[PDB]
Amino acid sequence: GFPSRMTVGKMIELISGKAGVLNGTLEYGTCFGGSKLEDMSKILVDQGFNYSGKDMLYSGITGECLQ
């Protein structure tokens, strides 16, 4: 649903959301500003996670990793 619709700001909702839950602060996604993408991936990288939100999933019906 992303290339035909070009809603990449939704992609910034997870990165500024997943790194907003961790250090207990509800973030700001206001127009022409808000949380910068550079210092929200810095909060997310020193908690032990990926800077870009990509986690590796162990599959559910077969148990092996996902490629």
Binding site: K18, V21, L22, N23, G24, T25, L26
Partner: protein, 68 residues
């Protein structure tokens, strides 16, 4: 309205950690991250239950259809 008993994703009981959270906010003044960290929850799931939650029943009980 009220805090849910179990979290939606995995099922950890987080309904018992709201009054202690409000007790750690007002007295023993901490930020929400550390006060929510020394309370239980480790993952960011089950942490979203206590962080992003509105308490509407305290605003609903001001309109009591009883005696008052």
């Amino acid at each position: 309205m009220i805090v849910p008993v179990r979290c939606f994703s995995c099922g950890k009981v987080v309904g018992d950690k709201w009054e202690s959270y409000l007790n750690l906010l007002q007295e023993d003044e901490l930020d929400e991250g550390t006060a929510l960290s020394r309370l239980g929850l480790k993952r960011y799931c089950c942490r979203r239950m206590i962080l992003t939650h509105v308490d509407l029943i305290e605003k609903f009980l001001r309109y009591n259809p009883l005696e008052k």
